Amino acid sequence: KIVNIGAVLSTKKHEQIFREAVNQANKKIQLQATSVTHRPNAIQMALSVCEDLISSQVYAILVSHPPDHLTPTPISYTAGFYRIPVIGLTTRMSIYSDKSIHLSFLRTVPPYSHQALVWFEMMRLFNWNHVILIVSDDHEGRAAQKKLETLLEGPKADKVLQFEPGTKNLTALLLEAKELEARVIILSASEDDATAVYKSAAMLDMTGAGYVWLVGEREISGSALRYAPDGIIGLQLINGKNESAHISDAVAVVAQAIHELFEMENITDPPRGCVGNTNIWKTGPLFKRVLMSPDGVTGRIEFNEDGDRKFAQYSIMNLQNRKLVQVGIFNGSYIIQNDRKIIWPGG
């Protein structure tokens, strides 16, 4: 039987790698590749998954978010009607960890919320037992709050202050950080949100000596880096935005998992098109259970209970003289510092 594996990738250069990865993966079943680019209008993307992917009887769809405005939701929802497993490769927003909405989603990347797992260790590495946690009243920010809170719970150290996304003037919040005797500050915002905090903090003298700014990847990215304060510590997912390596790895994953699934018995054929197939792929949930349950280009490939990637390292970054330096690397459990010395805000 021909088992086709679908993909929604960035451009033709990447769909090339995917069909080449399927090619170098066929070494009873033959695997064939069916791939498309994203459609900038997401309704038509939902119909393109029906007419170009599920119309080919797909066993799993992989989806790359390109370097904004294109989300995997149109593919997750459509394929999520049946439960054809969808393997994201790039997007890290924690909305995709909620299994009660995204019903057959795995991703070879950790969500942004999981970066709290590093700051925990920073605290345990610097004896920071009292933090002020500044986050956007957003699903992603509170995702960071929730996981930082639970791994702190062994939340007195956690003093949270919320701001509504799109708030330009944040003098009130940071003024309250001053009233709370703020020293170490963790922030979880979007790029243009983090920018707002950054400017508000450099105008009441909240970035100088005595302050520690601990921060994830989005806050040290794009627009936010330009105005990010001198001495801030950020994060950076290794092999994160490398779409190729994730295509190659996830193709290896679905290959091994296709073998393991055909080793089982009573595996039905996926639906052939959307119009007419109102019923669910019977052997879908089992196949994803196989996918969630090796070694690869990006690292130790393994998923947690939601299908999110486990065992991922972060480039630990410090902004020295308005330039990002790697002061260390997060093993995946322990956190290791390299030769370079760390500089705090002020010095």
């Binding site: 209008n41 309704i43 939902a46 029906c50 929802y77 009607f81 009660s100 119009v275 007419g276 209970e305």
Partner: protein, 335 residues
């Protein structure tokens, strides 16, 4: 005088289209600043492409101001799709039956999708009110990692933390898919697939202990491991037929549009199509009117997250045999 707005009432295998037509076509929405022009569409194909290519085609031919969706399935993926549709066309959709009403917490910021149904916190409140009636102040909770899990536990522990009466929460368990503990009243919270495996122990049950789960466990009440005497919270799917809900959804869209025009002297321009996009402020204004619609005295407001503020909830007992034993209106239990 009152302008007409186009509401699509889409019925997916939802007989009978006659009883639904006749019920609303006598509601005189004059005495409103806006009156509805309803166009039903009966469909048999319930897949993402068919639903999408129905909504979009209806938008491009007629001027569609609101969509009312009723379903005959237990497929939650319906709701997400329509909430995904809602947001990308900024046109209101109300999921009033079936999978369109399977409550979807945590959905799109841009969404205008609202469901006839309750939140996890609301039915938890109904549970603890059942106990307050018959004085079961000693209970447990047993939960899986399935989402909304903590929100449920959170709601229980909160309503009794902020109280003076002597609530005694015994043990709070979090299964994986295994320990023994003895409480007379429990609160099970999980999926109906995982519930049967959990219910498979000491068919713990069957002697002097009652068990109480919500709509998440009762599921399709018209469909071995389940205890006899199980008490559940569920939406009123007995004395509130599809005609009554189609008509209520119509009333909500029509009243929202009317209140907006009687205050702002205009209602939103219907959406050109799905393919085109270019030519947000109008959508959010109507959203504000949509979630605060008072009709027939009856308060039909919505939460900003997409569920009703006051759903018609019923307390059911488990022969076959789920049977209503109580009703919940506002904050009271008539059992």
């Amino acid at each position: 005088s009152p302008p007409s707005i186009g509401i699509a009432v889409i019925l997916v295998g939802t007989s009978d289209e006659v009883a639904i037509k006749d019920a609303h076509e006598k509601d005189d929405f004059h005495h409103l600043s806006v009156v509805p022009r309803v166009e039903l569409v009966a469909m048999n194909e319930t897949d993402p492409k068919s639903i999408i290519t129905r909504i979009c085609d209806l938008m491009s031919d007629r001027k569609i101001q609101g969509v009312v969706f009723a379903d005959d399935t237990d497929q939650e993926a319906i709701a997400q799709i329509l909430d995904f549709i809602s947001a990308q066309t900024l046109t209101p959709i109300l999921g009033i039956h079936g999978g369109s009403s399977m409550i979807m917490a945590d959905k799109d910021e841009s969404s205008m999708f609202f469901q006839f149904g309750p939140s996890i916190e609301q039915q938890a409140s109904v549970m603890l009110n059942i106990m307050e009636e018959y004085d079961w102040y000693i209970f447990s909770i047993v939960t899986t990692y399935f989402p909304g899990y903590q929100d449920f536990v959170n709601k229980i522990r909160s309503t009794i933390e902020n109280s003076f009466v002597g609530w005694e929460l015994e043990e709070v368990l979090l299964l994986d898919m295994l320990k023994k503990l003895q409480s007379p009243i429990i609160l099970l919270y999980c999926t109906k697939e995982e519930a049967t495996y959990i219910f498979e122990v000491a068919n713990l049950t069957g002697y002097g202990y009652t068990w109480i789960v919500p709509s998440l466990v009762a599921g399709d009440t018209d469909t071995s491991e389940f205890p006899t005497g199980l008490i559940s919270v569920s939406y009123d799917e007995w004395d509130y037929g599809l005609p009554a809900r189609v008509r209520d959804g119509i009333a909500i869209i029509t009243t929202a549009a009317s209140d907006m025009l009687s205050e702002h002297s205009f209602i939103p321009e219907p959406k050109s199509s799905c393919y085109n996009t270019h030519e947000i402020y109008q959508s959010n204004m109507l959203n504000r009117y949509l979630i605060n619609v008072t009709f027939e005295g009856r308060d039909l407001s919505f939460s900003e997250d997409g569920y009703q503020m006051h759903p018609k909830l019923v307390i059911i007992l488990l022969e076959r045999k789920w049977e209503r034993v109580g009703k919940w209106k506002d904050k009271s239990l008539q059992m």
